[PDB]
Symmetry: D2
Subunit: 305 residues, 4 copies
């Protein structure tokens, strides 16, 4: 009832699996990738570590039949952009990988929920949704969940107040164009303009600026997205109805008419997206969302399915 | 540096002790009361189950010396209201008990923080503060902390959304006249006036207060819920969390209140006690209710024989 | 499914429920007793505390129908000559047990009423359930405290001190010294008297009742541990009152504690310890006496 | 406050798995990472901080300057080379010793009261090398040794029997790897020795599986990371929490089991805040003693060829 499949045993996929099994998110994991020896090595390494825990089942194979009956499939596979490759060509090369992966996941787990983590995550969540044939509420992307959490942490740190009392989200397109919803940020219910306790825009820039600096320094990110994926899996498996900013089907919210995926705070539970939190955005916040959706729709129109 | 004393091994005090040691809040607990056999029996019952919890040092005695060096003293000792007993009579009977307890705690733990959990909690937090001689930020009462948790739970149940995204506080005087700060309620950053979700409101607060009294009417007392509440408050302080909790706190100087009373406000709690008070922009109706409660509290305080 | 019903909302029953909900053993609890106002009072007190926790379902009623579909039913209800005391508890259980089995035919029974061994036998017989689906709290608590105190004396963590008390709960229980080891080293071999540790574990248990009137926290924690083992399918080993006939050359159909492997189906297996003649004679002496008392019970 | 400060040396796959294990399992809230790769250190630091909302509050430092390790209670040493094709044991030991000659004096310079946990391979010899280089008391230097293999051993016994690992007891001791010693004389299930077991749900195969599967991991991905990271986190917790729990770790062996060689090999040790508080003295059989003595003999000879 709690089986999770992770596709891709690179840095992100292995950090996701390891976060999930050690944080007790699930005790039933499958890993799929194309490199048989690497897959078996990671499988055996984790099973040797399972020694420290109780009842953890791990499987791994190049054969997607190993994923059968998964409640969630987490997709981390993709390609890195080549120098001088266009944005559309990079999306298409990832799409061609997902053409192979996505229908196989659904064939073996027709009731699954998909969580897409491959970059660029918003358009590849749309692509995976289209390829899946699944309902819109059963396909999400890791989106801005990690950035929103780090945002709240940094606000909490500046204020000397626990993160559990500092509330707010980053929405929209993952990365530099994402939208800090300052109009909803509040500390114990007090909006920032109202704070009388014992500029801020840099905090958003910092969060999206640190994320790209990691890749330049160590070549990739792994731990933070791994923890974010583990949190999203827990919310779904435990039927938490907790709220997470994740890439989600956007058309029909915020006057957006383009069929795209961008991050919004979503109520997540066993059926997937139960509802989206409808934030009263300012016109400035809304216009940025619309601009991201328009540009993303234009790239999507060029994808060859 | 994590020692907690619990005064009173009645239902509330034992639920607090059990909550703290089974949830890892502290590993160093002292229980004080006047009932020597009951203290020893509770001590030995908790010790008999030692293999089923983290290692903990537990002491129990009628001698307050075992409380020496406590970071927090949780005071749950007191009487239960008698049939027809007036508020003044009940306050004075509890004050008489506190006159014995409080100076002994402060003698052995001059640097302690007091958490008062006897009813009526707001006035008895004031009494304990006045008797203790301690700084105002080092004496709090359980206040509306549990009421506020229940408030957010009932919002969560009505909306189908986890309590971790349903935000709001009940402030003021614990009980029928407490104040739901509707103006600050928000769901994932969305005020109620702007809420547009798939899955009236004022009933929720009435449900919190009516069900609270119904517990006391049916079994005679509350124990489990308040025990968990006190364990959460102790955790916030011991762990230096700077988390926000609605607790009975020194009110003069907040919201233009000039009465030296204690009522609940959301407090930032850490190792020093109350680090700060969250200053909510109250509506006129919310503010006037707080003021009326403060005025009535001052009048009852003037009748207490110290 | 993880629904647990606790029968009896006295001190032991409430301590078991509170341990289970706060230690995360289950999020689906039902409580049955005969006093409705006390029942709703406890229900509501726990529900208001669940405000601090995620999705916990609690029900409480004098009607056994609210126990329907329980994976485990924990029975703490009892009454305060020894045959007459056993008879009065049997009459109470004559009403309780058939109703529990009616509403949860696939349930496992954990009996906590005293005297636990004979009342586990009585519950099993009244239940019509397979022997592997009815256990008693038995010596599980005393064994755990025994290991803790050995560890404390040796200055080594309890997780490396191993051993069990078996047999009849209380003064006649059997410390199985032949199986006690520290990191795989038997006590006679330790290169880094003892009987007093067993005596004090059973002496302490009775001292608590004289001092505060009852025990609650320790047995509550023990019951929570047994429930977790069953619900999580741990196959962990716990000394519990269990069907004895056929083990250790016992021919009488009685219940006493042995270390049992506990999982989703109940007792998966019994750990078969090589007992000394003294250890086995004590077990047989207890079984012999239990058979004679059971022979006088009017069902 | 550095009361639980851990330094991890080396931010390769082992060191990062140890760091991540410790901070996400709450073992310590104060960690320092030291290596020679400035950018990698900063990237790992920032990656872990980026995920700060998803773990308990923690102070993380990372630097090529060992000054950041000052006041560490434990230093976990994972830096080292990977054996090259055809490389002799002597050559591999000396290449790792060259690295430790740099690392160990710097650790004890900045944390004179620290405990060392050595995790580079070959762990038993390199624990001896680190002890000699550190000048620390014998009970304050240990190696990861056979702790993980003992846990896997107990897990395999548990899987064979259908009984939780918490009731399957036993240790592998001696030299980590092919020559390690399963202490069959001390293996027991809920207090019952294997020769007495009569339960519902070839024994030697279990130890062979543990050693052969460990080698296979290294052949397939090139290294182990997740399992050893969890093992190191468990050892750190035992020491930091003063647990006095028993772990098979590489430890000073002279004077135990009639061994006269100043070597390190794994024995079950009681671990707490002072380091090794005591060694569990198992009544080993002739065969178990023979294997342990042979490993100690050979290890003394390898140690004699090390150039300090």
């Amino acid at each position: 009832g709690n089986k999770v499949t992770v596709v891709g045993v690179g840095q992100v996929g292995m950090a996701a699996v390891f976060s999930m099994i050690t944080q007790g998110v699930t005790n039933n994991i499958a890993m799929v990738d194309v490199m048989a020896d690497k897959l078996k090595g990671e499988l055996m390494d984790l099973q040797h570590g399972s020694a420290f825990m109780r009842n953890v089942k791990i499987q791994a194979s190049t054969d997607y039949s190993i994923s059968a009956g998964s409640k969630i499939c987490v997709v981390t596979a993709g390609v890195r952009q080549r120098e001088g490759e266009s944005r559309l060509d990079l999306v298409q090369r990832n799409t061609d990988v997902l053409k192979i992966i996505i229908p196989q996941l659904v064939k073996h787990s027709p009731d699954t929920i998909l969580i897409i983590a491959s970059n660029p995550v918003d358009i590849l969540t749309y692509v995976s949704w289209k390829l899946s044939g699944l309902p819109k509420h059963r396909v999400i992307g890791s989106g801005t969940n990690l950035d929103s959490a780090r945002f709240r942490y940094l606000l909490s740190e500046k204020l000397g107040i626990a993160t559990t009392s500092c509330h707010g989200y980053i929405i929209g397109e993952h990365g530099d164009s994402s939208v800090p919803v300052w109009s909803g940020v509040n500390i114990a219910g007090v909006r920032l303009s109202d704070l009388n306790q014992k500029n801020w825009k840099e905090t958003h820039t910092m969060v999206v600026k640190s994320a790209y600096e990691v890749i330049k320094l160590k070549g990739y990110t792994s731990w933070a997205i791994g923890l974010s994926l583990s949190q999203l899996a827990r919310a779904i498996l435990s039927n938490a109805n907790s709220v997470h900013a994740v890439s989600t089907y956007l058309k029909g919210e915020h006057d957006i008419n383009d069929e795209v995926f961008l991050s919004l705070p979503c109520v997540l539970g066993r059926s997937g997206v139960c509802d989206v939190i409808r934030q009263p955005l300012t016109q400035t916040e809304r216009s940025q969302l619309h601009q991201s959706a328009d540009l993303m729709a234009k790239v999507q129109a060029g994808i060859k399915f």
